[PDB]
Amino acid sequence: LQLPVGDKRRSGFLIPNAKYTTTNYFEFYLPYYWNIAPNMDATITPHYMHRRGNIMWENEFRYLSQAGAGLMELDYLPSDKVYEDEHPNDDSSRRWLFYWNHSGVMDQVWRFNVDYTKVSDPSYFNDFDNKYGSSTDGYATQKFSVGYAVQNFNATVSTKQFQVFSEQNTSSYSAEPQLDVNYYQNDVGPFDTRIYGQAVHFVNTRDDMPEATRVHLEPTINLPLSNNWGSINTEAKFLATHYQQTNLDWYNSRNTTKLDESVNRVMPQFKVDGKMVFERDMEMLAPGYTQTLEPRAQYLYVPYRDQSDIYNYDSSLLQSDYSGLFRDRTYGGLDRIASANQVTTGVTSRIYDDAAVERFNISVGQIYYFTESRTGDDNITWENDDKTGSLVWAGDTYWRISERWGLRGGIQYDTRLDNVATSNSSIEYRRDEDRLVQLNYHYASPEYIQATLPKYYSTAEQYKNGISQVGAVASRPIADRWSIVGAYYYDTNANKQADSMLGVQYSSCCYAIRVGYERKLNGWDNDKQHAVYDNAIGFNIELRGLSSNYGLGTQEMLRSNILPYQNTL
């Protein structure tokens, strides 16, 4: 029972591991592994925290069954001196976390999914280790779903709830329950037909907010035609929706526009999409290289329906990247459906080598609006009153410069913002899983933040400046046994650090030692109007030799910060 291996070895005490943080001072974990049965194990970890002066009991339980694979986590801290000092009027200072992640497909027809997180207080993730949550999370998700799916049909019953952490507007809507049905039929003459149905119940945490029951039907019929060089798809759709709204007294007493208790919204939709492909041999760059030029066009028409009498429960503005330019929806959900009279025009150029392998691609597109897109409840704050013309432009590019080099870029511009809406770029060199360097940049204009986010976001100091973040990640092994990892994410608007991480791992035949340091943004100080930083330096030891894991742990260290590394080739 002395130092087993935590994967599948007999039950016993694992190697204790310690760390020092600015939020908890000295912390140390003493885990005990318990192999209950095959496909069933547990881990009980006393986690002593000195600043809080107590022990948090962590209980992990992993299982596998015919219904799928699942993992439960239960963290309990009976008392908290820091929380009690910060909240002296509460009856108790206990903190706790419950987490459940289950995923499974049984008999190829049944699908079970659970993604549940529940914390005792909204500040839980700013005080404790981020393993199933993060300090960057704004809310905790609580989803259940059971679905039945066969080749031409599916029906899913799901429940979605959210626990909001920010103490600005904790009111959130939940779908208890939601039922989705899709049916398909592909050989109705030359046409392909499908039907989508939904029945949802929207309920709010606050007792004075409207509750809704929504039933939606969507019959769609399309005619696809294709050639060796081109294709065209014509689609005709109906959108029928019925709303039953209750608890409208408080809302109707505060707003000049009235919500209706019974609402019917029916609208047709017409879409025409067309693609062409041209080819040429580009001998000047290199013999045998092929350049393809693909124009794409799409006309979309949806009439206008006044939707001001429907509360917005689950509709949010969608980002318009190059792929999203040809999307037929402006909002998610079904509460807001914008009228459309528009044509989207784009072009994609690809370059393949002699081995028919794609090495380069670049896409540029725009949307031209013949009439203004409106829902009847238009409250988005733009920088100007442009309503028609070329309003949205998008561009994308990916270049595999060599086997080890890769470049990616994307840009989204909106003329209504008088500025570039969003942009991202990345350049990465990667020899293998251990030798890598990556530079990335993310930008979001303050105008976009003001347009697509609540008003206090455009007012608050910590939101209104947008995003201008440059990050550098690097990793290098030494002497086939040491691994060095570093990361630095820096904000250019405030000229302040956002995240920083170092990691050193020494790997041996039978054991591995990892030392990790991180300094991260962890909160905001409303009194002095400046950010809060958290520092953490920890050491861990794991036992090798019982498996084939001879890796140097570079990839695991790359994922240990609040801005984890992703491979962009």
């Binding site: 019917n264 029916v266 047709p268 017409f270 009439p303 206008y304 009847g376």
Partner: peptide, 17 residues
């Protein structure tokens, strides 16, 4: 009898005339 059934038309809600 146009109150629910006009919705299936392709015109806008503030159109006609």
């Amino acid at each position: 009898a146009c109150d629910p059934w006009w919705q299936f038309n392709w015109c806008d809600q503030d159109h006609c005339a």
